[PDB]
Amino acid sequence: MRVCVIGAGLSGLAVGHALKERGISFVCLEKAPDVGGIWRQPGAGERGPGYRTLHLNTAKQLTGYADFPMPDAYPLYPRHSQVAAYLRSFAEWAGLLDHVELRTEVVSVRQDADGPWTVVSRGADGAQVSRRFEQVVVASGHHNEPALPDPLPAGADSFAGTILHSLDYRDGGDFAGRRVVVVGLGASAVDIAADLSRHAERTLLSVRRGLHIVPKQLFGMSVDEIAEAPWWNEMSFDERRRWVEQALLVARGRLSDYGLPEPDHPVFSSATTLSDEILSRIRHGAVTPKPAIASFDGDRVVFTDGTSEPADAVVYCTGFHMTFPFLPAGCPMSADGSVELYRRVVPADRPGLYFVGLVRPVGAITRLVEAQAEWVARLVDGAAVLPAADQMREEIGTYLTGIVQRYGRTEGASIQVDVGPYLAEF
Ligand SMILES: Cc1cc2nc3c(=O)[nH]c(=O)nc-3n(C[C@H](O)[C@H](O)[C@H](O)COP(=O)(O)OP(=O)(O)OC[C@H]3O[C@@H](n4cnc5c(N)ncnc54)[C@H](O)[C@@H]3O)c2cc1C
Ligand SMILES: NC(=O)c1ccc[n+]([C@@H]2O[C@H](COP(=O)([O-])OP(=O)(O)OC[C@H]3O[C@@H](n4cnc5c(N)ncnc54)[C@H](OP(=O)(O)O)[C@@H]3O)[C@@H](O)[C@H]2O)c1
């Protein structure tokens, strides 16, 4: 009755733990046949952002729940199978599954003038049920709808091949002996180009802009334990900026010597993509750097420098869009490309709705959602309160009108934060 949680992923298990530890009645409605979120989906053969060779890029001790450590025989980056098995055994140890409805998809959420929210869910039977709930916590995560190129390049209609997104990619063993263009330079592109390159006959990597490809580790320490190390923090910014530059050139030299465009923005201003494989796949010819895709000329794809290439498939690793389809009201947005959420969680106009996990930090999100979960628990039963509406909107306006200075206008810079001082406020 008290709290309807949408999402049994990492973020929704976390919030369910935090209400349970306060004694608030709640349910997690999850659409998937088990808990775990995206990490469950490779190994269930299901269309999700992950793939079979997906691993963590954050340190296990920094990524597992601070109350429930990951198995110690786990490596610093476990596989998607290892984490999704860790999440479920977490749900077991917290006794949350009795409060979990699996295979139940929230189809709409509406606020009633009395305060409670009516929430209609769809079961495996295709049947729908409508229920009222005192508060609602959104925990559905923002990598849920595939983001395509704004126009598909010309002739895509008659490509005589197979054009897909990172969500529909699974093993690559499905691409054994074929010819694939990977479109992207993000965490999903580098990973998938390298998965092909062991299965594909030829593996191309089309890129539009240069990104700062960085190894998972420097000095033995992963890039996430460095941003918690006292030394790193005790240095300024320009001390850190050239610190990494020297380390990256000593570790991988110049990206231009791999066929990759040089970033138009320096490390810390141009998204970093962490890989320990791609450059060494270029240097062995297993993946071949390309520019943008210009056309689909028959059974081949034509690139912007002029080259042709026979291609049986193209998997677009072009990102994802943040959609919240069950809120007819509109995702908490500003229309300049920005989120409307006091402290990245609370909508100012709607009492009783929280958003857990709609943040993008450097490194693991886990502690951020642990904090968001504990604060939303004391908001529900009144052991914490919020400013007035207008004061909430002043915090949100300082956060916007600020992400333009450390960052800039773009896409989704509005769910972005530092780890340290954000969690300092808890
Ligand atoms: C490919 C990929 C790799 C990543 N790798 C890392 C990594 O290595 N390290 C790291 O720290 N972070 C990583 N992340 C970030 C990642 O989002 C978090 O690790 C974690 O998955 C948090 O997910 P979440 O619980 O917020 O939501 P998600 O796990 O994204 O999904 C939440 C759940 O909500 C459910 N849901 C959605 N809509 C409904 C509905 N209407 N009704 C019912 N249920 C619904 C979904 O089925 C899902 O189970 C990665 C993300 C992606 C996409
Ligand atoms: N643990 C892991 O190893 C792992 C694996 C996968 C994902 N993740 C995480 O999960 C999220 C998934 O993001 P993602 O991997 O999809 O990467 P992303 O950050 O969304 O980047 C997608 C890539 O597509 C390019 N692109 C965007 N629009 C394009 C267009 N219209 N045409 C062509 N190319 C275009 C971008 O180029 P530009 O940058 O130049 O715009 C970028 O290189 C990220 O937060 C990532 O860190 C982690």
This structure was determined by X-ray
Over its C-alpha atoms, the chain yields an Rg (Å, rounded) of 22
For residue 272, report the phi and psi dihedrals to the nearest 5 degrees.
Answer: -95, 140
Pocket test for ligand 1, best of 6, 30, 38 (most atoms within 8 A of CB): 38
- The set of residues, in sequence order, having a beta carbon less than 8 Å from that of 132 and lying 6+ positions away, is 112, 116, 117, 118, 119
Rounded distance from Cα 223 to ligand 1 centre (Å):
21
DSSP label at residue 318:
-
Contact at 8 Å (CB) between 82 and 202? no
Tell me whether residue 58 is annotated as binding. yes
CATH 3.50.50.60 domain residues, the chain: 3-144+322-424, 146-319
Which of 186, 345, 144, 343 has the alpha carbon at shortest distance from 275?
186
Q: How far apart are CA 117 and CA 326, in angstroms?
A: 12
Rounded distance from Cα 5 to ligand 1 centre (Å):
14
Evaluate: CB of 106 within 6 angstroms of ligand 1.
Answer: yes
Tell me whether residue 66 is annotated as binding. no
Evaluate: CB of 188 within 6 angstroms of ligand 2.
Answer: yes
Overall resolution, Å = 2.5
- In the block, which residue shows the tokens 């595939």? 146
Buried b (16+ CB within 10 A) or exposed e, 20-38: beeebebbbbbbbebbbbb
3-state secondary structure of 421: helix
Q: How far apart are CA 169 and CA 88, in angstroms?
A: 24
- The set of residues, in sequence order, having a beta carbon less than 8 Å from that of 106 and lying 6+ positions away, is 4, 6, 29, 31, 119, 120, 121, 122, 326
- In the block, which residue shows the tokens 């690559």? 172
The tokens describing 13, both together, are 């298990």
Evaluate: CB of 371 within 6 angstroms of ligand 1.
Answer: no
For domain 3-144+322-424, the CATH superfamily is: FAD/NAD(P)-binding domain (3.50.50.60)
Contact at 8 Å (CB) between 187 and 179? no
Query: Is 146-319 a CATH 3.40.50.720 domain?
Result: no
Rounded distance from Cα 109 to ligand 2 centre (Å):
30
Contact at 8 Å (CB) between 365 and 66? no
Alpha-carbon distance values, 404 to 210, 322, 336, 408 (Å): 21, 20, 11, 4
Which of 238, 338, 227 has the alpha carbon at shortest distance from 274?
227
Pocket test for ligand 1, best of 87, 106, 140 (most atoms within 8 A of CB): 140
